[PDB]
Amino acid sequence: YKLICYYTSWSQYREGDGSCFPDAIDPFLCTHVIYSFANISNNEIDTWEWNDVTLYDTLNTLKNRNPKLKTLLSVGGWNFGPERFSKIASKTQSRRTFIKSVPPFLRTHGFDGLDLAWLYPGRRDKRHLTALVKEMKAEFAREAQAGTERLLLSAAVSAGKIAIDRGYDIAQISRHLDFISLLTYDFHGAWRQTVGHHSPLFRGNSDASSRFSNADYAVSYMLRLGAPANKLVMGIPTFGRSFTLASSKTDVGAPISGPGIPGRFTKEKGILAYYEICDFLHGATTHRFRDQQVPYATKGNQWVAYDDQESVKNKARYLKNRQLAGAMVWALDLDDFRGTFCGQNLTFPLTSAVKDVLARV
């Protein structure tokens, strides 16, 4: 079983206990740690935060304590215009330039693979994504000829049917990628006003339309399209989405005037780290959708949909019953890495959970 874990570059700038460096990672915790978001300059992979070279090294040293640990560098991301990706992938000329540039950069900095986070390709991009993947993987194999371990190639994929149908050639890329991470937590629409859970596990025997929005269908659908079950990886959020209620209505479908207030350390609207969410719970009424098997809290005019040890454990089990490769946890910096916020003196509670289940069989 695989437990891919993401670490983001910008989680170093948070204040106080919110500050997180590669340093803070249990090297034995995960099996794959993805440093989050390299970049592209002059059609070539490049750094992002000034000290990346340093964090790179801090993170890559963990392998000194656990030799079987593997690390990957991810390209793209949210703050990386998808148009930019699209532009690099259409001109075979600029695409090659990029590909050929990766191995060295990786080899140089100690990574064991690259991770494509081209965040949502267009209907006009499917054809080139495939190209990018097919060619990149090719470059990688050729490089292995040099007598060294072959680099890993993976990709962060959307779990939205339409999204998937629009720009992904699953049956294709499935054969070139080492593993596919399903973004199974961006389900609730950032477009419409209404309380809703972003990472439901199940369809929810109560709401007709949009049965395509839940982990269960995502996985099932991917499998239909051809993705081998042994290459799939279910994404598990370690954060929660906050909403500013617009009425005393707290139950399903209640009004929403906007994104909840920021977090003391997270400082961003609609997003809360698990550890922040831990503090929040105090004096908050905890609810849990039986049908979707996920929890949400409400305090004052604040409504929060999130995941806990038990919601997370479920998915972990699901993940295993369909026999998938393993799990993907978004941001170890969002989990209680210090472990001093959520009661129990445990560090990385949520991730542990996912691990514990994956390890008892």
Ligand X SMILES: *[C@@H]1O[C@H](CO)[C@@H](O[C@@H]2O[C@H](CO)[C@@H](O)[C@H](O)[C@H]2NC(C)=O)[C@H](O)[C@H]1NC(C)=O
Structural contact between residues 31 and 72, judged by C-beta atoms closer than 8 angstroms: no
3-state secondary structure at position 160: coil
The answer on whether 184 is annotated among ligand-binding residues is: yes
Structural contact between residues 134 and 95, judged by C-beta atoms closer than 8 angstroms: no
Residue 50 Cα distances to 38, 46, 273, 300, 311, angstroms: 11, 11, 25, 41, 37
**Which residue type, as a one-letter code, is found at position 336?**
D
DSSP 154: E
Choice between 9 and 311, CB closer to ligand X: 9
Choice between 84 and 142, CB closer to ligand X: 84
Q: Site size for ligand X, by CB under 6 A?
A: 5
Q: Shortest distance, CB of residue 94 to ligand X, whole angstroms? A: 12
The answer on whether 118 is annotated among ligand-binding residues is: no
Candidate residues 15, 41, 67, 93; the one interacting with ligand X per rule CB under 6 A: 41
Q: Shortest distance, CB of residue 80 to ligand X, whole angstroms? A: 8
Quick one: which of 252, 261, 254 has its CA closest to 302?
Answer: 261
The answer on whether 135 is annotated among ligand-binding residues is: no
The answer on whether 76 is annotated among ligand-binding residues is: yes
H or E element, residue 33: strand 32-36
In whole angstroms, what is the distance from residue 91 CA to residue 88 CA?
6
Q: Shortest distance, CB of residue 201 to ligand X, whole angstroms? A: 36
- Residues 161-190, one symbol each (x = binds ligand X by CB under 6 A, - = not), give ------------------------------
Show contacts with ligand X in window 60-119 (CB under 6 A).
84
Q: Shortest distance, CB of residue 181 to ligand X, whole angstroms? A: 23
Our finding on whether 323 is near ligand X (CB under 6 A) is no
Choice between 80 and 187, CB closer to ligand X: 80
Choice between 93 and 209, CB closer to ligand X: 93
The answer on whether 50 is annotated among ligand-binding residues is: yes
Candidate residues 1, 21, 39, 228; the one interacting with ligand X per rule CB under 6 A: 39
H or E element, residue 75: strand 70-76
Query: Which one of 34-42, 137-145, 149-157, 337-345 is the stretch in contact with ligand X (CB under 6 A)?
Result: 34-42
Residue by residue, DSSP assigns 112-180 as: SEEEEE-----TTTHHHHHHHHHHHHHHHHHHHTTTSPPPEEEEEEE--HHHHHHH--HHHHHHH-SEE
Our finding on whether 45 is near ligand X (CB under 6 A) is no
Our finding on whether 40 is near ligand X (CB under 6 A) is yes
Contacting residues toward ligand X, per CB under 6 A: 39-41, 48, 84
